[PDB]
Amino acid sequence: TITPSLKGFFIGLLSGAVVLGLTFAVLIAISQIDKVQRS
Amino acid sequence: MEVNQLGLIATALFVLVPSVFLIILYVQTESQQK
Amino acid sequence: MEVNQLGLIATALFVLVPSVFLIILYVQTESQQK
Amino acid sequence: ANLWERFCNWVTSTDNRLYVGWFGVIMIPTLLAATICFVIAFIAAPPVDIDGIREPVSGSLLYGNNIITGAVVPSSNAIGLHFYPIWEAASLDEWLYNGGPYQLIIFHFLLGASCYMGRQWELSYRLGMRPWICVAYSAPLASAFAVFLIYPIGQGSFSDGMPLGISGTFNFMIVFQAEHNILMHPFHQLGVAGVFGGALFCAMHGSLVTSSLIRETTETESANYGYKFGQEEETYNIVAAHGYFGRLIFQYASFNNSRSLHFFLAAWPVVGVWFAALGISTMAFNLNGFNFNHSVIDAKGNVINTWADIINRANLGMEVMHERNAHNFPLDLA
Amino acid sequence: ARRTWLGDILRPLNSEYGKVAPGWGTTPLMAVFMGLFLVFLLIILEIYNSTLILDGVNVSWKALG
Amino acid sequence: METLKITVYIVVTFFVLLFVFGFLSGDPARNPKRKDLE
Amino acid sequence: TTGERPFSDIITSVRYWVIHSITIPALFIAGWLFVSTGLAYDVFGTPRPDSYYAQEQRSIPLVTDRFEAKQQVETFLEQLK
Amino acid sequence: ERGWFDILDDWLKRDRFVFVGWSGILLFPCAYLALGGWLTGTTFVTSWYTHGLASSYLEGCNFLTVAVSTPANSMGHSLLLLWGPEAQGDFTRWCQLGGLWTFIALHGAFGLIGFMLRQFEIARLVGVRPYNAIAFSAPIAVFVSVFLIYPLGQSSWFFAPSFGVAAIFRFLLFFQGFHNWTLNPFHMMGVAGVLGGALLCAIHGATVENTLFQDGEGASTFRAFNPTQAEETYSMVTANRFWSQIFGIAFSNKRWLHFFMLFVPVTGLWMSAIGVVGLALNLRSYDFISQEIRAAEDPEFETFYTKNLLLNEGIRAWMAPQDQPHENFVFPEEVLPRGNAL
Amino acid sequence: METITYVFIFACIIALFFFAIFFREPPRIT
Amino acid sequence: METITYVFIFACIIALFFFAIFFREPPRIT
Amino acid sequence: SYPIFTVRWVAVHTLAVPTIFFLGAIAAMQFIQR
Amino acid sequence: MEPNPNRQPVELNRTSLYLGLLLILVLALLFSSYFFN
Amino acid sequence: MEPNPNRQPVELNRTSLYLGLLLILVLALLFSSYFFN
Amino acid sequence: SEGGRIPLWIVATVAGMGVIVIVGLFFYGAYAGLGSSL
Ligand code: CLA
Ligand code: CLA
Ligand SMILES: C=Cc1c(C)c2cc3nc(c4c5[nH]c(cc6nc(cc1[nH]2)C(C)=C6CC)c(C)c5C(=O)[C@@H]4C(=O)OC)[C@@H](CCC(=O)OC/C=C(\C)CCC[C@H](C)CCC[C@H](C)CCCC(C)C)[C@@H]3C
Ligand SMILES: CC(C)=CCC/C(C)=C/CC/C(C)=C/CC/C(C)=C/CC/C(C)=C/CC/C(C)=C/CC/C(C)=C/CC/C(C)=C/CC/C(C)=C/CC1=CC(=O)C(C)=C(C)C1=O
Ligand SMILES: CCCCCCCCCCCCCCCC(=O)OC[C@H](CO[C@@H]1O[C@H](CS(=O)(=O)O)[C@@H](O)[C@H](O)[C@H]1O)OC(=O)CCCCCCCCCCCCCCC
Ligand SMILES: CCCCCCCCCCCCCCCC(=O)OC[C@H](COP(=O)(O)OC[C@@H](O)CO)OC(=O)CCCCCCCCCCCCCCC
Ligand SMILES: CCCCCCCCCCCCCCCC(=O)OC[C@H](COP(=O)(O)OC[C@@H](O)CO)OC(=O)CCCCCCCCCCCCCCC
Ligand SMILES: CC1=C(/C=C/C(C)=C/C=C/C(C)=C/C=C/C=C(C)/C=C/C=C(C)/C=C/C2=C(C)CCCC2(C)C)C(C)(C)CCC1
Ligand code: OEX
Ligand SMILES: [Ca+2]
Ligand SMILES: [Cl-]
Ligand SMILES: [Fe+2]
Ligand SMILES: [Mg+2]
After folding, report:
1. d(CA A7, CA A11)
2. Rounded CA gap, N38 and N27, in Å?
3. How many domains does the structure of chain E reveal?
4. Which residues of E touch H85 (CB under 8 A)?
5. C-alpha–C-alpha distance, residues H57 and H67, integer Å
6. Cα separation of D156 and D178, whole Å?
7. Whole-angstrom distance, CA of residue H312 vs CA of residue H308
8. Are H264 and H200 contacting, i.e. CB atoms less than 8 angstroms apart?
9. CA H142 to ligand 2: nearest atom
10. Fewer C-beta within 10 Å: chain L N or C terminus?
11. What is the DSSP letter of D215?
12. Is E36 inside any structural domain?
């Protein structure tokens, strides 16, 4: 069974995944837009 | 005073062992070619 | 056993001090130029 | 050259292995007297009636102390601020019982160290240096003055001077907390910022310079051999160091001027410790740390404790226990 | 260098110093395993911490008897 | 105890006089550069 | 230099102060109202001067149970009538 | 190779006013959340339900007395996550249970990791040796030992330091009264390292500033330095002679000098960390047994050590009931240790 | 025996001060 | 502690035998 | 000639808008009476 | 036997000797009280 | 200072080391019993 | 838009006075209402 605290764990896990995911998506997007001039 | 009766040898070896290590290293350093 | 409580430090320093003297002399001998 | 002339030339000679100098002429004997008396007392002095209540405290090694617990114990509270040289005692036994060594040692020490500072100026002058190393040294010296002289003055007794020992030091500190709430005093807080800060910047500086040493050595030898004493060129790349630190924080938080950097290194701990010393020296006249005891009150008037009040409970414990036989009346007023 | 019977036998196992798989190779899979491992550690930690409480999992000396 | 007192007073006086006359003995001139400061 | 505008150019420009004579006071007032409306108390669960104790009580509402802590606190809040 | 990873790497490592790097992804959010957590708690949040303490400006505390306090002892060593079984996602209750303490402690920890990683990354990019990071290992040892390991060895986070000025002072005095922490030789080494570090900072700074070569005409001498100049700005030889004649010994090697400047405070802090690790287990330097046996047998035997233990006993009995409310201590007036009159 | 030990270590430290100052390796400008 | 000392010294002597035999300075004809 | 919204801008802002608001709350607090 | 090329001479200069002895003696002076207890 | 010409190097060869350690250790094994008494 | 339109010394003076005012207010608050001990 999923105890209240296991639900808590899933919520926490999801929260962390969302924060990291959005962070990297935005940072990648930005890096893609704002490219470094080479050569 | 009722001190730990191993305090003396503990302190003595604590001082002597690394001091000796260093003296060995120094003296064999001095004897090296200049 | 009711041994002399200084026998340990006496023996330990008896071994260590001249042994260390000899090791110092040997090692500083080896490091001299061949 | 006549004898006095020759003497003056030797005293102020820049070629003496240790500089003597005129400040040195006072410094050397006072520090030697202080040192010898200290060592002899720390090893062999009998117990001292510090608080003047015929309750002798054993400070010396031979009288049951180790290195951590041992001290030269402050002179008797019965003496107060009275001058107690050996010759004011009927005997050395009396002098020892009453804590004369403490006075002899602290006065010779303070004089000798004041002369150490003057001596730092003096040698700086003889060598054609800028003069202010001694000013930096004024920070620890003042602090010693704070704990050995100024506090006793304010409180009325050398029995209240910091004992010349490790645990005695801790005693002094705990009693001081009880009586002045020094932790809650902004000058002590500045002291802490000074020493924590000093250590931080020491480690930081050391690390950046070590980080930017120019490769002059192989891997099988110490990098220190890459610098030779007295070489004209700098041994590390400060532009690289600044390039690192500036990126670590941001460009303008980083020093690029080595003179400005070293001035900051000098000034931060010295100023901070000056404030520490003034903390002790003003708490000596009982202008004490912040008191927020019962500062927070609810609508009815109930006291709502803060961390300050818990501090206050600890302080109370210290206050009520210290010198458990010395007080006959309810208020500790000095 | 000295050859030995056992050395001759083991030779192949220390012959590929510096050999690499091209580019990123299996890094993404490794990363997946790292994430799973992190979650595992998080689970056992929160169990031990009693932040994660599971049915039939009594984190106590009194777990069974 | 008086004898110790006198001895210390004399010693201290001796060294203090050394300090004072010492610093009176042309101290500004005792530097490696500009000596004429009188 | 790193490519961004110098701070001194920005904070010495008219545009900046046109924007921030609006934005700074606005944030300041928003914080002020965050406290003066009492919303801070409600958000953080900080007792008002009249909500530390019930009228007669002198015992601290100390949390004593890890997993029923939430309930213990709620109960403590109810006992404030 | 020119995929998304390398492109992201390009952007992350661009020379901007505030360098970011891969390390920044960890560092900036965690550090921001730690600082913001602290400011938020100290401004708005109580410690009434955890400590029976007011701890915010909102309640009337000042900068010195505000804190984000540790959770109640009953919380044990709960991570106290917002979504955990204690707060169950209720932010207000979370605040009231002390969740901001673990929030700040953990984010602060990962933030320190982030910062040291930042030190490494930047060192690698600029091409310097990573001694600044290595030196930074000492503050991390201190933080980990004091704010994590220490409470982990005790009953709960409650006994960790609370994040506040006065709260930290309380922590100090607690360690004196209960651990006799001043008596601990690891603490003694910490003190030696800190004061010795400050000494080195001050003395080196003063020495450099007072052995400068005249490199300009200005009476204010700072302008007469150029960051790119090849020459030493001060005289090592003169400095060395000065200290040799003043103090008896002197540096002759600048590299040794600066490594030593790294070594002293870092080593000190590390030693103190070891001692605190001991205190996690109550493995204290509280007593000298020989002292106690003698004192127990001889009521005229007194040292500063025994005086300090009397002080400690005072601290414990007088502070414990309010400092440890979960114990429900009631100490009748008559059992309170007190000297005459006071 | 404790006192002997403490005083001994201290004495060794002072002797060490003596050698460290008057019998140091001299600094040499290369 | 006595026994420890005796056995320790003995073990040191045996180890010494080992080094004196297998790690001796080799005799060389000049 | 110069960009406006930089990483620098973001950093400055997350440290600034919160403090402005916070300071205003504190100042609100200074008048609260029990 | 054919000699080992990985061999290196070892050094400790006088200043390092003095520093080391200082470390050991001061550590001993500090901890001794605790060894005797 | 002008160097002292009476200086001589000192040597202890490995065989001498081994002999000395043997002497010392065996002497210790002999006398230790008496030291403990 | 133009950098330097409002002198940096004025900006510094005004911001400085703003700081002085806010901190002054906090100190006033130390003697009144909550935390005043009254
Ligand atoms: C990188 C930056 C960073 C880091 C390291 C942390 C780290 C931490 N934060 Mg977080 N935090 C961050 C940014 C960060 N935070 C930000 C930006 C915010 C603002 C939104 C917050 C807001 C925040 C809050 C509000 C809280 C925390 C807390 C926590 C802690 C526990 C988090 C956890 O349990 O995650 C678990 C999740 C992961 C570790 C992610 C795993 C990813 C794997 C590899 C992928 C698998 C997921 C998969 C797709 C899902 C499928 C599941 C399915 C079966 C249902 C922890 C100390 C809590 C805390 O400190 O309590 C005291 C807490 O309450 N943080
Ligand atoms: C001579 C007097 C003296 C001295 C020099 C020290 C010095 C030392 N003591 Mg102290 N101590 C003393 C007396 C003294 N003590 C006394 C009388 C007591 C009473 C018994 C104590 C009780 C005591 C305790 C209880 C403790 C110390 C600790 C320590 C060490 C603190 C190191 C440090 O900087 O941590 C500061 C913290 C860090 C280095 C962690 C990392 C900090 C990060 C980098 C901060 C990042 C901040 C960030 C940028 C945001 C800032 C935001 C802003 C708004 C604030 C240090 C060795 C501690 C210790 O030993 O720890 C091992 C400790 O816990 N001491
Ligand atoms: C109280 C003492 C103390 C403080 C406050 C402190 C602070 C700092 N030292 C730093 C550096 C250093 N410190 C070093 C050695 C030392 N530092 C020392 C003592 C201190 N150092 C000592 C004694 C040493 C000697 C070993 C080195 C070698 C460095 C550096 O390289 C670095 C630097 O650049 O210096 C300029 C900076 C790290 C910046 C950072 O992580 O930002 C990011 C912010 C983060 C990660 C958030 C941290 C959150 C913390 C851990 C918990 C939360 C704290 C609350 C927000 C505040 C609570 C306040 C109450 C407790 C009163 C920062 C300014
Ligand atoms: C999950 C989420 C979304 C992730 C997203 C990540 C994304 C990429 C981030 C991008 C945007 C980001 C920037 C927004 C920022 C968010 C927020 C602002 C983070 C805050 C983090 C943190 C709390 C900031 C704290 C501020 C700072 C760290 C304080 C410490 C700095 C301190 C004050 C420096 C001043 C002190 C100064 C005097 C030190 C000098 C003395 C010392 C160093 C001398 C030594 C020395 C110096 C030299 O100079 C040189 C030369 C040499 C020789 C030398 O001896
Ligand atoms: C709102 C309040 C109202 C206002 C009230 C006013 C209050 C009085 C403020 C006090 C004024 C201080 C003046 C400082 C000038 C100065 O130092 O110049 C000397 C140099 C000049 O800078 C250098 O300047 C050089 C040019 S020049 O020398 O200036 O010409 C340049 O070459 C170099 O790169 C540059 O770094 O300054 C520096 O080296 C860097 C700054 C170091 C900080 C000095 C402060 C001392 C330490 C802090 C004290 C510790 C406190 C904490 C306790 C632990
Ligand atoms: C002007 C105010 C003076 C403040 C007190 C002294 C502080 C600096 C002295 C420290 C001694 C270190 C050892 C000597 C090290 C040494 O030799 O320094 C050397 C350094 C440079 O020497 P210069 O010869 O080039 O310049 C000094 C004179 O010759 C005239 O230029 O001197 C200075 O920089 C003095 C600058 C005055 C301006 C500094 C003010 C900073 C302090 C502000 C106070 C704030 C505290 C508030 C607390 C919250
Ligand atoms: C279980 C068996 C145990 C037997 C093992 C024996 C243990 C041997 C322990 C060795 C330790 C010797 C340390 C070498 C000491 C020494 O050689 O330092 C000088 C040395 C400089 O090395 P260099 O890179 O310049 O190369 C010179 C070479 O000749 C060194 O071989 O720096 C270091 O060793 C790093 C540690 C710094 C140590 C500095 C601390 C000293 C400051 C004074 C501290 C006491 C006073 C404090 C007053 C408050
Ligand atoms: C925790 C929380 C989190 C996060 C939040 C944050 C992040 C916050 C931020 C914010 C912050 C970030 C705060 C603000 C600030 C600061 C203040 C509160 C103000 C001030 C100032 C001052 C008062 C200064 C003054 C003084 C000094 C210090 C300097 C100089 C001198 C003077 C006197 C001026 C979340 C939500 C995710 C979730 C859960 C909870
Ligand atoms: O002598 Mn040393 O401590 Ca200054 O307070 Mn009153 O007197 Mn006694 O009591 Mn608390
Ligand atoms: Ca009212
Ligand atoms: Cl006392
Ligand atoms: Fe330097
Ligand atoms: Mg108020």
Report:
1. 6
2. 15
3. 1
4. 50-51, 53
5. 9
6. 18
7. 6
8. yes
9. 62
10. N
11. P
12. yes
Instruction: Give the DSSP H or E segment for F22.
Output: helix F2-24
CA distance J18 to chain C (A): 17
C-alpha distance from residue D260 to each of D207, D266, H205, H220, H256 (Å): 18, 10, 10, 11, 22
Name the experimental technique: X-ray
User: Does N29 sit within 8 Å of K29, measured CB to CB?
Assistant: yes
Please give the angle made by the CA atoms of C21, C26 and C32, to the nearest 5 degrees: 130
> Would you say D294 is a known binding-site residue?
no
What CATH number should be reported for the domain holding residue E44? Answer: 1.20.5.880
Identity of the amino acid at D117 = M
> H176 in helix, strand or coil?
helix
Cβ of H58 less than 6 Å from ligand 8: no
Structural domain including D64 reads 3-184
* Residue type, position N12, single letter: A
Which residues of chain N make contact with D295, given a CB cutoff of 8 A? 35-37
Q: Is residue E56 part of a domain?
A: no
User: If you write DSSP's letter for every residue of G15-66 in order, what string do you get?
Assistant: HHHHHHHHHHHHHHHHHHHHHHTSHHHHHHTPPPTTSSS-SS--S------S
Cβ-based neighbour number of residue B1 at 10 Å: 17
DSSP state letter for G6: P
Adjacent-strand bridge partners of D303: D297
CATH number at residue D67: 1.20.85.10
Chain D: residue nearest L27 by CA? Answer: D67
Closest CA to A12 of H79, H71, H38, E48: H79
- Kindly identify the ligand whose nearest atom is closest to the C-alpha of D179: 9
> Which residues of chain K does G50 touch, with a Cβ-Cβ cutoff of 8 Å?
34
Q: Which of residues 1-34 of B touch H (CB under 8 A)?
A: 1-4
Task: Flag if G12 and N1 touch (Cβ within 8 Å).
Answer: no
CB D148 within 8 A of CB D161: yes
Length of chain I (residues): 30
CA-based nearest distance L14→chain I, Å: 6
Q: Which helix (H) or strand (E) holds A3?
A: none
E–N contact: 3+ Cβ pairs < 8 A: no
Q: Count of H helices and E strands in chain I? A: 1, 0
Is beta strand H67-68 parallel, antiparallel or unpaired with respect to H163-164?
Answer: antiparallel
- In this complex, the chains that touch G, judged by 3 or more CB pairs closer than 8 A, are D, E, H, K, N
Angle (deg, nearest 10), helices H131-143 and D186-211: 140
State residue D240 phi and psi, 5-degree precision: -65, -45
User: Which residue in I2, I21, I29 is closest to H249 by CB distance?
Assistant: I21
- Token code pair at residue H255: 């590299």
Instruction: Give the span between the Cα atoms of H331 and D294, in whole angstroms.
Output: 21
CA angle D168, H197, L18 (to 5 degrees): 90
The residue written with tokens 């402005």 in the block is K20
Q: Is E27 on the interface with H (CB under 8 A)?
A: no
Any domain includes E17:
yes
Cα–Cα distance measured from residue D108 to residue D37, given in angstroms and rounded to the nearest whole number: 10
At D48 the three-state DSSP class reads strand
Range of the domain at E16: 1-51
The domain spans of chain H are 3-341
Extract the tokens encoding H210.
């007072």
Strand partners, M19: none
How large is the angle between the packed helices H99-126 and H131-143, nearest 10 degrees? 170
Q: Which two tokens stand for residue D84?
A: 């107690």
D323 is in an annotated binding site: yes
Q: Residues D269, H202: contact at Cβ < 8 Å?
A: yes
Q: How far is the CA of D319 from the centre of ligand 11 (A)?
A: 9
Q: Are G2 and H15 in contact (CB under 8 A)?
A: yes
Measured between CB atoms, does D319 come within 8 Å of chain H? Answer: yes
Q: Which of H93, H251, H280, H250 is CA-nearest to residue H186?
A: H280
Kindly list the residues from chain I whose CB atom is less than 8 angstroms away from the CB atom of residue L29.
Answer: 6, 9-10, 13
